[model samples]
Target: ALRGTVTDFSGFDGRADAEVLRKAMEGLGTDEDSILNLLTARSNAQRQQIAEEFKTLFGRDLVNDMKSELTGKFEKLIVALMKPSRLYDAYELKHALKGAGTDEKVLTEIIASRTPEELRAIKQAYEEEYGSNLEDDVVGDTSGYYQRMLVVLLQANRDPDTAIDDAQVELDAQALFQAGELKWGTDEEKFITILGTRSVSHLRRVFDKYMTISGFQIEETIDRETSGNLENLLLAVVKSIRSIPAYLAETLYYAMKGAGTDDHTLIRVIVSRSEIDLFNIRKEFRKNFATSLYSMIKGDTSGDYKKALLLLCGGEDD
Candidate 1:
């Protein structure tokens, strides 16, 4: 369980002067570990206090500073600790990538995993920050089936525990069949939108209906509809629908299976999703897949990558 409220580390209740905050940042500075622990572990309500404290003490936006100080996955994690609306913007940026170069991993992850409410928030924020509609951006940035699938994801907008309305089921099935099984080209956008935007629980229901109504498994559909890197992405979307925890387990499995693992993706995924569904994911992985998450980590990666993964996966820095 995350702490409901965190102490004001910045001591920003109008006590410290601006110079004091500046000097502290410049010299002794805030402890990164403590900051990470609190910010990452605190509930959304609690993080609000921390963000407020950051502004009060430093006379600067906490997120702005974090954006400057951090880079890559580290920066992405810190930035996620900011206002919820901004978090959506950051995620939208991940999805908004397109045109000749597709950051498929970012797009797939974002669309495959977030709840409907989160997606709604992200969509609203994307439009607000960019002064353009989310759908328009998709049209502008992408082409072919990839574009079509993305548009479907943005439009589907299903929530957790979403009822399997007969109408919805039919519509969703059609969308999947067209984009997944029936379509000649890749429709990764639809794959991610359904996989990432719906709650795992709700998606499970959707998948049940999809199999019976469409007479095809989601994975089989994707295998038929697409090929190459885009196919893997679509497969990831289908896999997420069946079980997000299992999907993650497989992600770890592949990352560490070869001579040298894709340590970057491994470290990034563990570091990034730890505070989200990681603990629950581990439990689900154990129950559904019959392997300890720790065991998976131990087998695949080594050294700093392994160490960092263990820490992110709840190991300590001894």
Candidate 2:
């Protein structure tokens, strides 16, 4: 089941026939967008091989070529796949806009979507590559509400494999008491601290414990306890925790739905989330809306955008 779920993108080695690789690069030159789409969807090892081959054959790096051609969020999207370290890939995105000059889109999508271990791996990679801690960088670069949420997520030091802990339920219940019901209503810092500091595994237990003790959803507790944009942000975090790719797909679905269309969001989500949970997104999208994700994309978008989205969706069954 696991093998079926995860694609073996490493199946194709990068050691190519000099002529074949040369052709591939030439093909890339003509169809650069497709190349980026393809490579972005490839596995880490595959990307590394392709990068090496590009150097050996063309005396230039694939990532450099990509970085040069693309910029802002899109460039980050392609470069993320090129790097061997997934965490490094994720951190570079965070570092790009976690400052006074904000790319809130990138920060929100990434932090809201990435698992605890993925974020931790990114932090480790950031420290290794830049000789600075992720937390310290966040401290230096961000402030206020945005800063607080980013910091909270960054500080969430959840071990991925660890099961739910009973202690976390007590901890969450206590935090809730101090943050909301005990006081006027909702304590933003306390809520963010609990949700951001703990892993989903722990949070799941915390939520369950909250329900057992209080006979209500933690989200209800949050709703009763907070105010302003901070309330919205915490709500976003709660939604993110429930089912992440669905959260992203819903965002992407809306991005492409409006007039003028948010092409960047469309492309980024298609390229980024396809491998992780697109399969489930496909199922959920159809179940919720009565329209297949692949079909919806095909009908709404056009040209290369349509083709790329379809390819990532693995197209529809006959």
Candidate 3:
């Protein structure tokens, strides 16, 4: 399902790539443009191979060289490109849990959007990198109904089957309808079980049935019945189920729309989705915002950081 634009390099030669990267990073002032052009053009797999060769030949870490040569957001971009995708995501998850308060957006985006296999990889990677369980970390950091939803997601055993269970869909619709509007108090458990455990195809059909039966969109019901983080989590589940690309497009738009840019979010979505569905996300962004993502990036960011993000974004819409 995740399709990346950067494929295996044609006639790839890791030793040559390492030498080119060494030259780019060595000498006076560092050739930032050369680094960007060379690095961004290769897939992450290729980058990792180059890093391996760089270490073997030079007896130094390529990441360390880039870190010393580059500073600020530019360094962040190059670093992100250098790491394997799963390991990079594990770090993102770790960063989300640190500092003053948890980055709810990052947690939700990563937890809710990743496929079950991907989540398992993150969990395994997280434990290896941080010496703790991701599930335990999440439980320690969050609370209330929102925490419960996150706990369910952390299991990473989602039913990925897309087959439609017609009777089951209608049954789920009825259960949701009864649990929310038809009843006085909402059964939060039912909502969580159905939304968290059901396959995306099943949930989509259930939502359609729910709308027809209740006359109010499931999202509307969620807003009216729930408040705070629980509301956001549920809404995110709905969005992710309906269309992950569209959900992520809106996330990117919000990341850049306000007075101050959410650089962390901008970097996460673009970097993570670059190989997956960034092009589709970009299309959804243009359709929804009536402005190109490239134009938005151009307006909101400057310098090499901006350039790196745009390159990963696969350039501006025409």
Each candidate: what lDDT? Answer: 0.58, 0.64, 0.86
lDDT of 2 by residue, 75-179 (tens): 555665455645554554655655467555666677667777677777777777777777776667656765788777776565463765676669777677667
> If the candidates were sorted by their TM-score against the true structure, best first, what order would they fall in?
3, 2, 1
TM-score of each: 0.62, 0.73, 0.94
Worst 10 residues of 1 by lDDT: 2-11
Q: In model 3, which residue pairs have backbone atoms overlapping below 3 Å?
A: none
| Candidate 3 CA-lDDT value | 0.86
Deviation of model 2 at 99, angstroms = 7.1
Give one digit per residue, the lDDT tens place, for model 3 in 263-291.
87888788787777888887788889999
Per-candidate total of colliding backbone pairs? 8, 3, 0
Off by over 4 Å in 3: 160-163
Candidates, ranked, lDDT: 3, 2, 1
lDDT string, candidate 1, 25-110, tens digits: 45444534444544544444455555566677667876676566545645555554454534644454544464466566666666
Of 2 and 3, which scores higher on TM-score?
3
